[PDB]
Write an enzyme that holds these catalytic residues in place. Structure first.
Site, PDB file in Angstrom:
ATOM      1  N   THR A 219      -7.438   7.121  -3.492  1.00 40.85           N
ATOM      2  CA  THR A 219      -8.766   6.724  -3.939  1.00 40.85           C
ATOM      3  C   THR A 219      -9.724   7.912  -3.892  1.00 40.85           C
ATOM      4  O   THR A 219     -10.719   7.930  -4.618  1.00 40.85           O
ATOM      5  CB  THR A 219      -9.278   5.498  -3.176  1.00 40.85           C
ATOM      6  OG1 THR A 219      -9.133   5.838  -1.798  1.00 40.85           O
ATOM      7  CG2 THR A 219      -8.548   4.220  -3.543  1.00 40.85           C
TER       8      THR A 219
ATOM      9  N   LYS B 249     -12.847   9.389  -6.363  1.00 40.05           N
ATOM     10  CA  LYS B 249     -14.172   9.750  -5.898  1.00 40.05           C
ATOM     11  C   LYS B 249     -14.612  11.074  -6.523  1.00 40.05           C
ATOM     12  O   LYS B 249     -15.773  11.219  -6.906  1.00 40.05           O
ATOM     13  CB  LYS B 249     -14.213   9.766  -4.371  1.00 40.05           C
ATOM     14  CG  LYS B 249     -13.940   8.422  -3.720  1.00 40.05           C
ATOM     15  CD  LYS B 249     -13.799   8.515  -2.210  1.00 40.05           C
ATOM     16  CE  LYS B 249     -13.012   7.365  -1.658  1.00 40.05           C
ATOM     17  NZ  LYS B 249     -12.814   7.516  -0.220  1.00 40.05           N
TER      18      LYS B 249
ATOM     19  N   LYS C 296       1.269  14.338   1.901  1.00 45.72           N
ATOM     20  CA  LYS C 296       0.085  14.705   1.136  1.00 45.72           C
ATOM     21  C   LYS C 296       0.023  16.220   0.920  1.00 45.72           C
ATOM     22  O   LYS C 296      -0.814  16.698   0.145  1.00 45.72           O
ATOM     23  CB  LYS C 296      -1.185  14.186   1.818  1.00 45.72           C
ATOM     24  CG  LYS C 296      -1.308  12.676   1.946  1.00 45.72           C
ATOM     25  CD  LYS C 296      -2.495  12.269   2.800  1.00 45.72           C
ATOM     26  CE  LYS C 296      -2.713  10.777   2.913  1.00 45.72           C
ATOM     27  NZ  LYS C 296      -3.365  10.230   1.698  1.00 45.72           N
TER      28      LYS C 296
ATOM     29  N   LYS D 186      -8.538  14.247   3.202  1.00 43.08           N
ATOM     30  CA  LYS D 186      -7.673  13.079   3.346  1.00 43.08           C
ATOM     31  C   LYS D 186      -6.973  13.160   4.707  1.00 43.08           C
ATOM     32  O   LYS D 186      -6.923  14.234   5.309  1.00 43.08           O
ATOM     33  CB  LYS D 186      -6.628  13.029   2.226  1.00 43.08           C
ATOM     34  CG  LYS D 186      -5.781  14.281   2.063  1.00 43.08           C
ATOM     35  CD  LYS D 186      -4.963  14.314   0.780  1.00 43.08           C
ATOM     36  CE  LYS D 186      -5.768  14.344  -0.513  1.00 43.08           C
ATOM     37  NZ  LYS D 186      -5.687  13.077  -1.282  1.00 43.08           N
ATOM     38  N   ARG D 187      -6.412  12.038   5.185  1.00 41.70           N
ATOM     39  CA  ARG D 187      -5.615  12.073   6.403  1.00 41.70           C
ATOM     40  C   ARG D 187      -4.563  13.180   6.300  1.00 41.70           C
ATOM     41  O   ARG D 187      -4.032  13.448   5.214  1.00 41.70           O
ATOM     42  CB  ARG D 187      -5.045  10.688   6.726  1.00 41.70           C
ATOM     43  CG  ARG D 187      -6.107   9.679   7.148  1.00 41.70           C
ATOM     44  CD  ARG D 187      -6.834  10.042   8.434  1.00 41.70           C
ATOM     45  NE  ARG D 187      -5.904  10.104   9.557  1.00 41.70           N
ATOM     46  CZ  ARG D 187      -5.700   9.117  10.429  1.00 41.70           C
ATOM     47  NH1 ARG D 187      -6.385   7.986  10.342  1.00 41.70           N
ATOM     48  NH2 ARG D 187      -4.822   9.277  11.404  1.00 41.70           N
TER      49      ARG D 187
ATOM     50  N   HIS E 232       0.799  -1.219   0.000  1.00 41.39           N
ATOM     51  CA  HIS E 232       0.000   0.000   0.000  1.00 41.39           C
ATOM     52  C   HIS E 232       0.837   1.277   0.000  1.00 41.39           C
ATOM     53  O   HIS E 232       0.288   2.345  -0.249  1.00 41.39           O
ATOM     54  CB  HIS E 232      -0.983  -0.008   1.170  1.00 41.39           C
ATOM     55  CG  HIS E 232      -2.214  -0.777   0.859  1.00 41.39           C
ATOM     56  ND1 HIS E 232      -3.207  -0.264   0.043  1.00 41.39           N
ATOM     57  CD2 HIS E 232      -2.598  -2.024   1.211  1.00 41.39           C
ATOM     58  CE1 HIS E 232      -4.175  -1.155  -0.084  1.00 41.39           C
ATOM     59  NE2 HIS E 232      -3.822  -2.251   0.635  1.00 41.39           N
TER      60      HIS E 232
END
Ligand code: O9Q
Ligand code: O9Q
Lengths: 809, 809
Positions: free
Chosen positions: A649, A653, A547, A541-542, A350
Site C-alpha cells: 500500500t 501512497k 522486501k 516499510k517493515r 494478506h
C-alpha cells in the site's frame, strides 16, 4: 489560507476560540500562564471532538431507525496514527482552527506534532484497516471496526550504535481524548474449563472469566456528516478474581495482560498462548455485541443483517465461536448454524509466505478453548466429506485440505478454517488473488470456485493526499475542483494538463517545497544535513528479507564504488533514505538495519563523495513519519521478489504523492503500471514466471557472484570489514545468507536493478520530462483509492450499496 | 427545601440544567433516551466540578502571590468517601442542584448513591486525614494532602454463610471525575542500588527508577471559596524499563504494583517489602515536589516556608529522605541539614498497641534503601550521644532509646526515628498523650519535654452533621443560625433549649425520621426487617480484640438468655447493629464476625423473642454507610479496654448526631464525658489505673467465670454448640482466648457493662429525659470539631494563623 482546507468564517472562528478557552479552563484546569503546548493540543483536541459528538449520536440513532445491514470489520490491528488533523479535514474545520488558534497566538502545526500516533498495528494490514474505516464512513456504510485496545502499540524504535533498540509505546500516558469508555457494555469472555455432554447438548463449564470493556472512537466520513465507531476491547479482571489477599489483587494483572501489548511481528506467526488469548478475546466479545445488536432489531435473517469481515486469520475463531453460540446457546441444529456462519463470514488473505500462516498446535486449543476444538474437528469432518464426494479416491487431496495437519505436533490450519467457513475469500491484488488460486488454495478453488475473489487494496486520499500534502491537493483543486477527494477517478482529468507549463511548474514547486520542509525536519529533530536538490530515493516499510532492503543496499554500495572509481565524473546526486522497524526477534532484519547505518557511516563521511550521495536510516517509521516523508519523495522503492508482496500500500501512497516508482512486477505494482502505462514506470527484475523457472533448476548465487565483478567487489567489501573496521566479520551472516540461503534471490535481480536505476538518474537530469511522467502517475492513481476497494467489497461480498448522500448536520 | 442547603435561585437552577445537558451530550456522548442513572450521576458530577475549577485556579494562584507557609500532610491513607454531596455542601449548591435535577425529572439522592467511595483508608487514621483536609481548607491554610492513588482501596466486604469474604474495590472502573492527572509533574523515585563514597560526598548509584505520576483532587473549604489540593501519586514504569520484548513490556506491572493496593490492616504492622516501597514512594515524590515549590518562591528559610506533618510512622522515611536531599544533593553540612529537618517535621502518634509499631528489619532497608540506612545509623549515633551526655552511665536508657533494636533480626524503630527527627510529637487525645509520656516514650519525654503535645482528634461537622443529618442541622439552624457549621462551639447555645418542649419534640422527630429512613434502607438493599421503635444499639468500627465487639456479644447473649428465662416480662426492645471489616489475615477478627452472625441466626429466628431483640451485622461498613447509620443511632458503643483506643473518632460522630454513649474512660471518651458532664454519659468499667492493678497481680478470667453464673452460662453455650449446631466446636478459639489469653480483659468489664446497659434501657423508657440528655450531648460536642484540632496544630506546631475570611469568587 488554501481552499481545500474549508472556510474560516467569523462565527466559526469566534466559536472555536471560546470553546478552546472553555476547555483550557474547565477541562484542563489550567490558565494561560501555566499552559504547556501539550495543554494547548488537548484544548484543541477537545474542541474538535465537540464537533463530532452531535454527528456521532445522530449517525448511531439513524442506523437504529433505518436498521441497515451492519458490516463488522474484525482486525487485531488498526494502525490509526493521529486523529486531530484527520478529524478537522473530514469536518471541514482545518482553516477555521488554523485561524482560531492563530488568533490565540498559537501555531496549530506545532500542536498537531504533540499528538501520539495510535500505533495499534505493524504495517500494511493494520493500515489497511484504518483506510477502510475512513472509506466505510465516507461511503455511508453502517460499519464497525472491532479490535483490541492495546496499552502498548508498536514499539518506538531508537537507533543506538546503528542498532535498533525497542522502547514501550506508552501512547495512553497523557490520556486519549478521542476514546469514550463504555463500562456499561462490558462482556464476559471465557477461557480454559472443560466440555460436559448432557441430554440437551454440550456445555462449557469451569471456565475462567475475563471481562471485555469496550472503548469507542469516532470515525468521521468525508464531509458527509457520518460518524462510525471503532470499538476496541480492554481486558479487566472480575472482582472476585483470585478472591493471600494482596497477591490475589496483584494477580489481576494476569488477566489484564491480554490487552497489554500488540505483537510486533509483520508477516510472521508466533505460536504463543497470549496471542491466542488476544485472538479469542476480541472474537468472543465482538460476537456477543454483534448478536446483542441483532436481537434488538429468526436467525435465518442473521446474514441479511450482519457481515463479518476477517482481516487475515487473526480472527478466524469467529467461525467456531459463531457456531458455538448458535449451536450450544441458541439451540440451532448444526446445518442451519453452519449456513448462517458461511453466509455471515468472509476472509481476506494478506500473504502467501509460509512463515505468516497461522498453524495453532492442537494442545494449545485443547487447554484454552476445548469446545472450539470439538467444533473445529466437526467442521473438518463434514468439510472432508464434501471433498471425498467431489473427488472420490483422491486421498492426497483430503490430507492437503484438512483443517488438521498431521506431524510432530498436530496443528490447526486457520486459513483452511477461514475458507471452509466463509462465503468469500479474497486476495489483495490481482496477481496475489491469481496466485491463491494457482498455488496455496488451488484445492479449495477447485471445490468452490465461486468463493474466490480479488479486491485490490487502496489507500484513503483523505489522509494520504489532502492531509499530508495540502499543496498538491490545492494545485489539483485549482484545475479540476474538490470532487476528486471523494471520487479519486476524477484525477484522470489531469491527463489533459500534461503539456501545461503552469501545471508542470506547480507540480514541481510543491515537490520542492515538500523536500525543503522535510530536509528541515531532519535537521531540527535528528541533527542531520541533506542536500534538497538531490533525488530523494525512499524505501520505507517493515524490514524484511522479502522486501529486499538488501537489494537497495547493494545499489547504494554500487553508487559509492562507482564514485570512488571515477571521482571527477558527474552523477545525479541522491539522498537514499531507508526506514522501517524490524520485529524484535528477527535477527536478520536487525542485521540489515545495522548494515544500512554502517553504509551511512562510510558513505556520509567520505570527502570525495561530497553531497553527491547520502544514506539516511529514517528512525521510528510510523504513520506520522509516512505523512512527512512520502510527500517529499521522488523515487518509491518497491523491490520485493516477484510473488512475495501480496499487494503493498506504500506503493500507492507514493504514486498519489508525486514520486516515480522503481519496482518488480509484484503485488499492486502490476496494476499501477497497467494504470499509468509501463513506459511511466521503472519496472525491472524477474516476473513470477522467471522466479519459478529459477526454482525448478535451482538458485545458485555463486553464479551471479562469479559473473558480475561489481557484485563480487561489494561482497568482498562486506566480508573483509570495509563497512565494519572494528568488527571485520560483523556481516558474515548477511554474506553467508546471500551466497547460500537467499530465498529472495537478491543477486538474481541485481544487474537489472542497477541498470534500471541508471534510467531513473537519466530521467531526473531532465526535470520537465520527470515532472510530466509524475503527472501521468498522479493522474492514473485513482483506482488505488480505498473508496473503490470498499465499494467493491460492499457490492460483491457484503451485499450493501455505498452512498455519498450527506446525513443532516 | 431546607435552609442550610443554600438558595435555589432561578438563574442558578437554569444554569445548572443547561450545563447538565451540555455534559450529558458532549462529555458523556449520550442523549436522554440511552442515559442510565450512572450517566446522570456523571453529568451532575461534571456540572458541580465546573464550579470548583475557578476557585481551585484562583486559590493556587493566591498561594503563589502571597507565598504563605505551606502545610504538607503526609499520609498513606485518605479515607475520603463520596465527593459529590460534600462539594455541593461546601459550595452552597445543594438546593440549586436538587431543584435543577428535579426539573429534569431526576432524584438527586438516587444519583448520589451511584458514586463510589474513595476508600483509600482503613479506619480512624485515614478518616482523620480526610476531616483534616476539609478543616484546613475551611480555615484557609495553604495545605496539601499527599498520598498514594491506590488502584484498589479497602476491600468490599461480603458475608457468605456468616463469614467475611473480600472483593477487590475497583473504585476507578467507571472513572473518577474529581481527579486531574498531571503527567507533566511526573518525578523519578529510586530503589535498590548501592552507595559510592567519593571526594565530594556519598552517591546513590545503580538504582531502579519508578516514576511517580500525580493526580490532583480539589478540597473545597466551607463557603470560603478556598479549594486546596490532595495530590496522590501513581506508580508508572519508565519506557526503557526491562528494555524477550513481550515479557519486558508485561514486567512493567512489577513497578506499577507499588500503587496497586492499600494494605487492609488497621493498627497492625506487616513487615512486607511492597509496603516499604509504598512508604518510600510517597515520601520521595512528595519531598521532591515540596522542594521544587520552595525553590520557586537559603535552606535556612525552609522551615519558615514548609511544615511536614507525619500521619503516624508510615511516612517516617521523610526524615532520612530530607537529610539525604539536603546532604547528598544540596551539599549542606550534616548539622544544618538536621536543624532544617527537625524544624520542618512533626509526628502524630495514633496508638500505643505494640502490634501496630513499625519495626522494619535492617536487611530490608539495606537492600531497598542503602543510603537511608546509613543516614539512619548516623542519626542514631548522634542521638545516642545526646542521651549519653544527658544521662551519663545510663547504659540501659541507651538500649531502650536506640533507633536500632538488637535481637534475632535487627530492626529500625520508626517511632524512635520520628521523635528524634521532629520538633513536635503529639498524641490524639489527652489520656493518650499522657500515656505516651508515662510509658512508651517516657525516656524521650525526659530528654526533650518540649516536644510532647496533645492534639485531641476531631471530625468535620460538614460531612458529619450538615451532609449526613440535614434534618438535625436545620432544627439547630432554626434556633441559633448557621454560624455553628464553621464554629461548632456555638452549639453550647443549645443548652438554653433543654427545657424547650418544641425543641425536645424536634430533636426526637429527626431521630425518628433518621431511624425510619435507615430501617427502610435495610429492607431495600439487604432484605432485613427491623422494628423502628426499638433502641438502635450500634457498634461500628474495624473489628478488633481491643475494641471488644466480643464484650457487646456477651451483652447480646445475656439479653437473649434473660428473655428466655422470663419470656413474659417487659424489656426495652433493641436493634443491636454491629459492623466493621476484619483485616483479611486476622483470624480472631474473622471469628468474631462469624460469632456475631451466628448469634443473629439464633436470636432473630426465636419466636419467643418477637421483635424485642434483633442482631444485625452491618455489611461493608465504610464512610458512606457511616453517613447513614450514625444519624439513625440511639446508643453509641465505645467499649475498648481503658488505655487501648488512642482517641477514636466514631465516638464524636455519634455525639454530634444525637446518640448517647456507653463507653469506658478511654481515648476521647474521657474528654467527651468531661464536656457533657459524667451524668450525661453511660461510663462503666475499669479505668487505666484499674487495668494496671489487674496486670500487676495477674488477670485470671476463670475467677470471673466462677463468680458470675450469667457469664458461665454464655461460655457453656459457646463451648457446647448452642450457637453452632452443625459445628459444635466452631468457637473453641474464642472461648479459649477469653479463658486463657485475653489481653483485653473482656470478663473484667462484663458485670459493670451489663448493669450500665440496664441503666440505658431505664432511661430509654422515658423519652423526654432521654432526649434532654441527648440535647446536653449535642450541645457540648463543639470541642470535637476538626476545626478546633487544626487551629491547634496550626498555632502550636505549624506556626501559621487560621483564617475564616472568604477568598473572592
Ligand atoms: C515472511 C518472512 C520470511 C522470512 C523471515 C521472516 C521472519 C519474521 C519475523 O518477524 C521473525 C521473528 O520475529 C523471529 C524469528 O526468529 C524469525 C522471524 O522471521 C518472515
Ligand atoms: C492491635 C492488635 C491486637 C491484637 C491483634 C491485632 C492484629 C491485627 C491484624 O490485622 C492481624 C493480621 O492481619 C494478621 C495476624 O496474623 C494478626 C493480626 O493481629 C492487632
Amino acid at each position: 489560507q488554501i481552499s481545500v482546507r474549508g472556510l474560516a468564517g467569523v462565527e466559526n472562528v469566534t466559536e472555536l476560540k471560546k470553546n478552546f478557552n472553555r476547555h483550557l479552563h474547565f477541562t484542563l484546569v489550567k490558565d494561560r500562564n501555566v499552559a504547556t503546548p501539550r495543554d494547548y493540543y488537548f484544548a484543541l483536541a477537545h474542541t474538535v471532538r465537540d464537533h463530532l459528538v452531535g454527528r456521532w449520536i445522530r449517525t448511531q440513532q439513524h442506523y437504529y431507525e433505518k436498521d441497515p445491514k451492519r458490516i463488522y470489520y474484525l482486525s487485531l490491528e488498526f494502525y490509526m496514527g493521529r486523529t486531530l488533523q484527520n478529524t478537522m479535514v473530514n469536518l471541514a474545520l482545518e482553516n477555521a482552527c488554523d485561524e482560531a488558534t492563530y488568533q490565540l497566538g498559537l501555531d496549530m502545526e506545532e500542536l498537531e506534532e504533540i499528538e501520539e500516533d495510535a500505533g495499534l498495528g505493524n504495517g500494511g494490514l493494520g493500515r489497511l484497516a484504518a483506510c477502510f474505516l475512513d472509506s466505510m464512513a465516507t461511503l455511508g456504510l453502517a460499519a464497525y471496526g472491532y479490535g483490541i485496545r492495546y496499552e502498548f502499540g508498536i514499539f518506538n524504535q531508537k537507533i543506538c550504535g546503528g542498532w535498533q533498540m525497542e522502547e514501550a509505546d506508552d501512547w495512553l500516558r497523557y490520556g486519549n481524548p478521542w476514546e469514550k469508555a463504555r463500562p456499561e457494555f462490558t462482556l464476559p469472555v471465557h477461557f480454559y474449563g472443560r466440555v460436559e455432554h448432557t441430554s440437551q447438548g454440550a456445555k462449557w463449564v469451569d471456565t475462567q472469566v475475563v471481562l471485555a470493556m469496550p472503548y469507542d472512537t469516532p470515525v468521521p466520513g468525508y464531509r458527509n456528516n457520518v460518524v462510525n465507531t471503532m470499538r476496541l476491547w480492554s481486558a479487566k479482571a472480575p472482582n472476585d478474581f483470585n478472591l493471600g489477599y494482596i497477591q490475589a489483587v496483584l494477580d489481576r494483572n494476569l488477566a489484564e495482560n491480554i490487552s497489554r501489548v500488540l505483537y510486533p511481528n509483520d508477516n510472521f506467526f508466533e505460536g504463543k498462548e497470549l496471542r491466542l488469548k488476544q485472538e479469542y478475546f476480541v472474537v468472543a466479545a465482538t460476537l456477543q455485541d454483534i448478536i446483542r445488536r441483532f436481537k434488538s432489531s429468526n436467525f435465518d435473517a442473521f446474514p441479511d443483517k450482519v457481515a463479518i469481515q476477517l482481516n487475515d486469520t487473526h480472527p478466524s475463531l469467529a467461525i467456531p465461536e459463531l457456531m458455538r453460540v448458535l449451536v450450544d446457546l441458541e439451540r440451532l441444529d448444526w446445518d442451519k448454524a453452519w449456513e448462517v456462519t458461511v453466509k455471515t463470514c468472509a476472509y481476506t488473505n494478506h500473504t502467501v509466505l509460509p512463515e505468516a500462516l497461522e498453524r495453532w498446535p492442537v494442545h494449545l486449543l485443547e487447554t484454552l478453548l476445548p469446545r472450539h476444538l470439538q467444533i473445529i474437528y466437526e467442521i473438518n469432518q463434514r468439510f472432508l466429506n464434501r471433498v471425498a464426494a467431489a473427488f472420490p479416491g483422491d486421498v492426497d487431496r483430503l490430507r492437503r485440505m484438512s483443517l488438521v495437519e498431521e506431524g510432530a505436533v498436530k496443528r490447526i490450519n486457520m486459513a483452511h478454517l477461514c475458507i471452509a467457513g466463509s462465503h468469500a475469500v479474497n486476495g489483495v491484488a490481482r496477481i496475489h488473488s491469481e496466485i491463491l488460486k494457482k498455488t496455496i488454495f488451488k484445492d479449495f478453488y477447485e471445490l468452490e470456485p465461486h468463493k474466490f475473489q480479488n479486491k485490490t487494496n487502496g489507500i484513503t486520499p483523505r489522509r494520504w493526499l489532502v492531509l499530508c500534502n495540502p499543496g498538491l491537493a490545492e494545485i489539483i483543486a485549482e484545475r479540476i475542483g474538490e470532487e476528486y477527494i471523494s471520487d479519486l477517478d476524477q484525477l484522470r482529468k489531469l491527463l489533459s494538463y500534461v503539456d501545461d507549463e503552469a501545471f508542470i511548474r506547480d507540480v514541481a514547486k510543491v515537490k520542492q517545497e515538500n523536500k525543503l520542509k522535510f530536509a528541515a525536519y531532519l535537521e531540527r529533530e535528528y541533527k542531520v544535513h541533506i542536500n534538497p536538490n538531490s533525488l530523494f530515493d525512499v524505501q520505507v516499510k517493515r524490514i524484511h528479507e522479502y522486501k529486499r532492503q538488501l537489494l537497495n543496499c547493494l545499489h547504494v554500495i554500487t553508487l559509492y564504488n562507482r564514485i570512488k572509481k571515477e571521482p571527477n565524473k558527474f552523477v545525479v546526486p541522491r539522498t537514499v533514505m531507508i526506514g522501517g522497524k524490524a520485529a524484535p526477534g528477527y535477527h536478520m532484519a536487525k542485521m540489515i538495519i545495522k548494515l544500512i547505518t554502517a553504509i551511512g557511516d562510510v558513505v556520509n563521511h567520505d570527502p570525495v563523495v561530497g553531497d553527491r550521495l547520502r544514506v539516511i536510516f529514517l528512525e521510528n517509521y510510523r504513520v506520522s513519519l509516512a505523512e512527512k516523508v512520502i510527500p517529499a519523495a521522488d523515487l518509491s522503492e518497491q523491490i520485493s521478489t516477484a510473488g512475495t508482496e501480496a499487494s503493498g500500500t506504500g506503493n500507492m501512497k507514493f504514486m498519489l504523492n508525486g514520486a516515480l516508482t522503481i519496482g518488480t512486477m509484484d503485488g499492486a505494482n502490476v496494476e499501477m503500471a497497467e494504470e499509468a502505462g509501463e513506459e511511466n514506470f521503472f519496472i525491472f527484475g524477474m516476473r513470477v514466471e522467471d522466479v519459478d523457472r529459477l526454482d525448478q533448476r535451482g538458485y545458485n548465487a555463486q553464479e551471479y557472484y562469479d559473473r558480475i565483478p561489481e557484485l563480487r567487489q561489494i561482497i568482498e567489501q562486506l566480508s573483509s570489514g570495509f563497512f565494519s573496521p572494528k568488527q571485520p566479520d560483523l556481516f558474515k551472516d548477511i554474506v553467508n545468507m546471500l551466497m547460500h540461503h537467499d530465498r529472495f534471490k537478491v543477486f538474481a535481480d541485481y544487474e537489472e536493478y542497477v541498470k534500471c536505476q541508471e534510467r531513473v538518474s537519466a530521467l531526473y537530469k531532465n526535470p520537465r520530462e520527470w515532472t510530466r511522467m509524475v503527472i501521468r502517475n498522479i493522474a492514473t492513481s485513482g483506482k488505488f483509492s480505498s473508496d473503490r476497494t470498499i465499494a467493491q467489497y460492499a457490492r460483491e461480498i457484503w451485499g450493501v450499496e455505498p452512498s455519498r448522500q450527506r446525513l443532516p448536520a
